[PDB]
Nucleic acid binder design. Sequence first.
DNA 1: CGAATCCATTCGAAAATGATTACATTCGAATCCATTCGAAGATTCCATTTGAGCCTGCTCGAGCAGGCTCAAATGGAATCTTCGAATGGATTCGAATGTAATCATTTTCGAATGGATTCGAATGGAATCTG
DNA 2: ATTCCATTCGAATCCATTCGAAAATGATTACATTCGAATCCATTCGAAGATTCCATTTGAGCCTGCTCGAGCAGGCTCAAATGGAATCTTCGAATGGATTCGAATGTAATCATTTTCGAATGG
Lengths: 77, 80, 91, 91, 102, 95, 96, 89
Amino acid sequence: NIQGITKPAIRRLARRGGVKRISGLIYEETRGVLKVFLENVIRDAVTYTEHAKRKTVTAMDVVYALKRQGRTLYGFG
Amino acid sequence: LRDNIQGITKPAIRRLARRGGVKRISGLIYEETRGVLKVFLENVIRDAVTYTEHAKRKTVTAMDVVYALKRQGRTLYGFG
Amino acid sequence: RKESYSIYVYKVLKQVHPDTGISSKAMGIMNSFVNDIFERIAGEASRLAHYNKRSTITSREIQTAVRLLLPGELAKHAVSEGTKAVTKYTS
Amino acid sequence: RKESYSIYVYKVLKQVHPDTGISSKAMGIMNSFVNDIFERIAGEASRLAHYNKRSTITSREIQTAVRLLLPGELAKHAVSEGTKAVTKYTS
Amino acid sequence: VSRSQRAGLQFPVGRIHRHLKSRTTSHGRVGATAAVYSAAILEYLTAEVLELAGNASKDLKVKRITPRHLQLAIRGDEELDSLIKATIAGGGVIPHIHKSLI
Amino acid sequence: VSRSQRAGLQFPVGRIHRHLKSRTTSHGRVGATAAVYSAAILEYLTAEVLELAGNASKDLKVKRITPRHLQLAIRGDEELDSLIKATIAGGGVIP
Amino acid sequence: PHRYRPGTVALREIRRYQKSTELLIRKLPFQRLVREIAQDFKTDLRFQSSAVMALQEASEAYLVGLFEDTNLCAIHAKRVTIMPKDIQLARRIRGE
Amino acid sequence: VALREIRRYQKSTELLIRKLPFQRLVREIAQDFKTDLRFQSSAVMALQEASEAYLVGLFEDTNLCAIHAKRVTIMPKDIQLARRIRGER
DNA sequence: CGAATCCATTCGAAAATGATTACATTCGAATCCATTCGAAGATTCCATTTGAGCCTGCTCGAGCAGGCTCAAATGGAATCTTCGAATGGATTCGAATGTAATCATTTTCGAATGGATTCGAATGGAATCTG
DNA sequence: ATTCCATTCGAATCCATTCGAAAATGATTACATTCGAATCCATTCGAAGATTCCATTTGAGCCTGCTCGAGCAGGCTCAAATGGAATCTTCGAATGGATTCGAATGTAATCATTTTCGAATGG
């Protein structure tokens, strides 16, 4: 399902980042980086959910995990 | 006390660079190194003096420096 | 029931800009900002009280925590505002 | 008088390496390391207890705190050790 | 005769006292003049951020504040940028293009 | 019979219980097995670090342990390096 | 046959995507990816929508910052094209 | 001879800056925050250790940046880039 | 060879036992939201191929700036001496915070709408690639 | 001469500011008692001098390796057009799991004794 993050989406993210020219092997590197980041965050989100004896992942577990990682987020609680 | 930043001589910077793994060094590196060292020292000493002043003391101890370092994220082991 | 900081944020906004409004998402962001800053100050004050083998938290601890946490040219004005408020409250 | 973890560190060292000594500076390093880890675990456990609207700290909070902080295989091993101790304590 | 009116503020003093008393470890007391200091600090910071955001909004000929204006106001000031390192949901990035790319 | 002897440990359980009780906010209670869990974790980590440092000392033909050995042991392991990011006064650098 | 020289439309999209504030990845593929990744930790989970949206916002911000650092590294070596080595150097210096 | 110095200074553990000049610099810097101050030897030692570790790490990152651009000589550009990516300035 | 590591010891500070209460956590029900699931449709993004010019990598000549050697002088180390500056501990006391009742606010949640805010056009104001 | 875009008019649409009801919860008065100032006194401890060998630093010269600029060729990313997938929107039953409210237990904190232990000092 990692192939659902297409090449034009990476081009748009690069453009917002300020990149004028892009190589041809950037996309796979970006996909790997994104997968690693997502795994790291989701691990802690699920740990927080399991401690509370629940089966539904809420927004506050994600907020707490992001704050733990050092990536505080404003707007969701 | 004036112009004490020039006591960080060229050989000392060369030794630190050698331990860092540097083969060749430009001639304009020393001024940049002195500037960055001054900034680092100023921040840490400011925090240490704040910690000392809160306790109504006149002597700067090792624990003030340890706490000031831990505040920035530069934890140090072996001094307190 | 649930408590928040919306009333006071709206009061301050109407105090500084009497003809400008706010939205709901900006209100949520402001609430998060206030909660975060409060948690930081409280934690630093507790640690400062613990270091000197004390039990009570006073305005000295708050002043030192503000001096340690806020960047320069913001610590001076904040300390001035707090000192003025305490002096007015006492008298 | 002041407290320290010197006796227990020496006992553990005599358990692992029965013929090796340890200097004073390494002892100071180990004391600092132990204090750091203990403070981290205690803080995380307090936060976990607060998030769930509870007042008692139990072994479940310690287990979850260990799971959050320690990386990879370490955490797994640590958990096992702790569990064993509890089973030997209650019986 | 509320304590906030006596101090001359808008943020509460009793509620801040109640909140401070719940995070003081064990057997920890809280003085009555710590709440005044904390309320004054919070009000000052809020007023600063709101003023900058209102100026940024008025520069664009609109009559409301949105997270975009909050991000624009925060990232344009050095002290506020240094103090706040969180992610504002709905702000984007400040436009900037390198000289060698044009 | 001490609680540590019942649990089979070397680190203290009563002292750790007393230390944990002085961190709970306002009226906060602490169980009796939280101390046992904490003592077990601390003892395990200490034993691992000491074992690695002793192996390094045996490699370097020294009977004693110095901060150089601790730095070598800590920086040579992936998880120990990940967990410990502090500065050891007297270690140097890894070649 | 009107044509644009290579490099103008790139600047046009740079301005267009730096002026806006929306999200750039589609929602359904990201939701599917999140579910597949999370199924390796616990079976039969459920997700609030807000959790997925928070994850998407964080991911997008992370990628934009990483690309800014990559562009800096590419400019250092006297180039305008970004390559995998720039990403590797930026991530190595940042501590990741 | 440049590699011999690297091999010699990577194996040792002592300090590389002289003690008296560093102590004088520390006192001169601290003069700006409070007059008529006193120090302990432990405070100066802790400051020296921290400073040396910081400089060595910075020089490692600088060497990486210099190698990226196909060179062996380090310049101020590399220091500026390393401090910019770390988010120090 | 000597600067450090290890063992003997007496005593206060602190941990283990035993009742006793309350306080907090556990074990059924009963709504009732809110997440998973299935189906149909207009269209807007996305995937693939063709043409081509601009950016990247490599070679060669030229300058330039860093490392290596040597002699002379300098400023950091190293070992007492004086002292006078500053912590640290005891013992009152005086300032200040918590606890218990009793109101009288004050803040939170659920409807009502007039205005600031999205689509849909619009032609003026550039921006551009070819002459 | 061909496209593209900040900025300005309609238009149904959306939403932020008022307005009421009522349940927490501050604010006042009167004890009780922790807790932190305020003086005095011991002693470590940090600062300022004096006196040298000897190691470390600093100019001065030489020259070779390293970085820089220019002319070329080939690798390769961009721009445009045509089919064709698949996300987005809306609707509707079927289903699962948080959340609140009573009762019945499990367990941790608080005194009163007794006793084991580890921190400081020598050797």
